[PDB]
Amino acid sequence: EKKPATEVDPTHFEKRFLKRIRDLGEGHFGKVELCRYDPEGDNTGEQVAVKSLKPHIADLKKEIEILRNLYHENIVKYKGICTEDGGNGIKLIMEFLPSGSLKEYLPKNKNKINLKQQLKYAVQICKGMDYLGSRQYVHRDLAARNVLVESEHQVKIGDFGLTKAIETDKEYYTVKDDRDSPVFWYAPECLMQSKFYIASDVWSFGVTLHELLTYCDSDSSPMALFLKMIGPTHGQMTVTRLVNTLKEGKRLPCPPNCPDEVYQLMRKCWEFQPSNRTSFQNLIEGFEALLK
Ligand SMILES: Cc1nc2cnc3[nH]ccc3c2n1C1CCNCC1
């Protein structure tokens, strides 16, 4: 067969040149690893973040198609895919951000990162989220560990494994498997009825903001703080207890050194009724007013 010219697709990453360095993070079905795409074989190739399945293909495939089509400075950049001649299997290739998530970066840089800079992170997170909301997506997994640091001045939403499209004319996505829910980040309606509204992402932003304000310290994490509030030994009764505490109107406490006007913005993310929650737009305005 007279075969045509072998054109280069910059988004096609060959498996044979994708060399593992270390693990970056892991769910239950997926893992991300730092790799070097090193076709010259001399360890000068580009570092990239590679997400694959643990030995759900259709899910990863939809995550790829979602990220590939998102274009925003506060959203991690798709770089491409890795596929094998055999087929079926696929890995997602993302830019690698050396500073990691807020979980790695914040505890190491307390001295550099003050309140104004935190509030700018908060604005950038809201802008990425708002951009996402406008494409009719609910993220469902917003948490400090899913916010990457591009530079001391810039963050990016850095994973989309649970992201779902909201149907046209509907206001929420109804979820089926919820076993692996980040319950300490989830709004009541997600916990009780398993429905996800954009306002549900707003709630999760509320807690992500808390983590940011406490610099992602483990003893101040939403999980640790909630378990302390309700009892850490209730096992299968934990979510119920959690739902009650929220129904009772309890919320995470104000972080030390968090000024009440920032805390009050946080509170509006946690109004019990979805409809009463501030929007990402309002949040952006509120934050911007504090930065003037
Ligand atoms: C911890 C971490 N560091 C990253 C650097 N670059 C990345 N690029 C894409 C992810 C990603 C990174 N991650 C996590 C983010 C949350 N999901 C697991 C990996």
Q: Where are the alpha helices (DSSP H) in the chain?
A: 57-68, 102-108, 115-134, 188-192, 198-213, 222-230, 238-247, 260-269, 280-291
| Beta bridge partners of residue 31, listed in sequence order | 26, 52
As annotated, the binding site includes 24-32, 51
Experimental method of this PDB entry:
X-ray
Pick from 90, 93, 110: nearest CA to 102:
110
Q: Is 25 in the pocket of ligand 1 (CB under 6 A)?
A: yes
Q: Is residue 280 domain-shared with residue 166, that is, in the same domain?
A: yes
Q: Is 159 in the pocket of ligand 1 (CB under 6 A)?
A: yes
Q: Between the CA atoms of 243, 246, 252 and 258, what dihedral angle is there, to the nearest 10 degrees?
A: 150
Separation of CA 74 and ligand 1 centre (Å):
14
Scan for tokens 């306002």, then name that residue.
199
Cβ neighbors of 246 (< 8 A, separation 6 or more) are 188, 272
The token pair at 32 is 């991300």
Q: Is residue 161 domain-shared with residue 277, that is, in the same domain?
A: yes
- Say what the resolution is, in angstroms: 2.2
| CATH code of the domain covering residue 146 | 1.10.510.10
d(CA 255, CA 58): 40
Separation of CA 141 and ligand 1 centre (Å):
14
Q: Is residue 136 domain-shared with residue 54, that is, in the same domain?
A: no
| Beta bridge partners of residue 291, listed in sequence order | none
The token pair at 255 is 């972080």
Scan for tokens 């696929």, then name that residue.
90
Burial class (CB in 10 A: 0-12, 13-18, 19+), 153: exposed
Residue of minimum CA distance from atom 19 in ligand 1: 25
Domain boundary among 80, 96, 112: 96
Domain boundary among 96, 122, 157: 96
| CATH code of the domain covering residue 23 | 3.30.200.20
Q: Is 148 in the pocket of ligand 1 (CB under 6 A)?
A: yes
Q: How distant, in Å, are the alpha carbons of 76, 146, 162, 233, 257 from that of 159?
A: 8, 6, 8, 31, 29
Q: Between the CA atoms of 195, 144, 121 and 275, what dihedral angle is there, to the nearest 10 degrees?
A: 20
d(CA 272, CA 206): 12
- Residue range(s) defining the domain that contains residue 19: 1-96
Pick from 198, 181, 170: nearest CA to 274:
198
**Which residues carry out catalysis?**
141
d(CA 18, CA 234): 45
d(CA 186, CA 164): 15
